[PDB]
């Protein structure tokens, strides 16, 4: 029960409006598309698994890519480099020891030179004006998780998974704030594991009613369901591992109950 939880939560809430990527930015990228994006992100999921990075690192990396593509046009040839740069930055900012630039080059099958990688680090830092402390869905879930009773390892692991699913498709998710998607994710998982729902502490803490959460629950339920279909499958193979209780295996509910 810190003296800060509330100011922090408020602050994070303020901060996230500042850090919001442009909602319709993929429709003005003349050479890349949401699906190329989906490919890019699914790769970072794995690159994260291979070097055993934290899950926050991945949320940081996607936020940077989205803000950067939100004001720079990028060719489909240079997009991976942008993703590598962003995973590098997020690494440096969130990890206790990042992998070295060398390793980041390796994982692209020596496809760019480590100088290209370093110079795109620099270009990303400029475009984002060294603003790297962005709130994320994972940040808000961790906050929200303090208000559960009893704590459930399985709701947590599942909530995280759903939040990572939203990372992959820019439509529809770029429309919602991370605070809101964490909302949806928290409830959907909690519902899924237990039949319970978005608690009142959260409703009073956040000011989100289950009602306002609705439109985003619709989409997160749809993703959850089409989950094994999806052209990309790294987040599922990730959350099959039992460090996570195998949640990705558990059965989506067919109906929300609202």
């Amino acid at each position: 029960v810190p003296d800060y939880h509330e100011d922090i939560h408020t602050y994070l809430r303020e901060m996230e409006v500042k850090c919001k990527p442009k909602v319709g930015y993929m429709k003005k990228q003349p050479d890349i598309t949401n699906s190329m994006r989906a490919i890019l992100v699914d790769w970072l999921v794995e690159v994260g698994e291979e070097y055993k990075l934290q899950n926050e690192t991945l949320h940081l990396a996607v936020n940077y890519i989205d803000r950067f593509l939100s004001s720079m046009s990028v060719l489909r040839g240079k997009l991976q480099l942008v993703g590598t740069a962003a995973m590098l930055l997020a690494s440096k900012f969130e990890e206790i020891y990042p992998p070295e630039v060398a390793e980041f080059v390796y994982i692209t099958d020596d496809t760019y030179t480590k100088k290209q990688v370093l110079r795109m680090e620099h270009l990303v830092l400029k475009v984002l004006t060294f603003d790297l402390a962005a709130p994320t869905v994972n940040q808000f879930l961790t906050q929200y998780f303090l208000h559960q009773q009893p704590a459930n390892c399985k709701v947590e692991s599942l909530a995280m998974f759903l939040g990572e699913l939203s990372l992959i498709d820019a439509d529809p998710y770029l429309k919602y704030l991370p605070s809101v998607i964490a909302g949806a994710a928290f409830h959907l998982a909690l519902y899924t594991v237990t039949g319970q729902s978005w608690p009142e502490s959260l409703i009073r803490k956040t000011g989100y009613t289950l009602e306002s959460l609705k439109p985003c629950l619709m989409d997160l339920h749809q993703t959850y369901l089409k989950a094994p279909q999806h052209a990309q499958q790294s987040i599922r193979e990730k959350y099959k591992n039992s460090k996570y209780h195998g949640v990705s295996l558990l059965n989506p509910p067919e109906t929300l109950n609202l």
């Binding site: 890349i32 190329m36 490919i39 890019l40 790769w43 997009l79 991976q80 692209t108 099958d109 496809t111």
Partner: peptide, 4 residues
């Protein structure tokens, strides 16, 4: 791996 290389990637689009």
């Amino acid at each position: 791996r290389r990637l689009f």
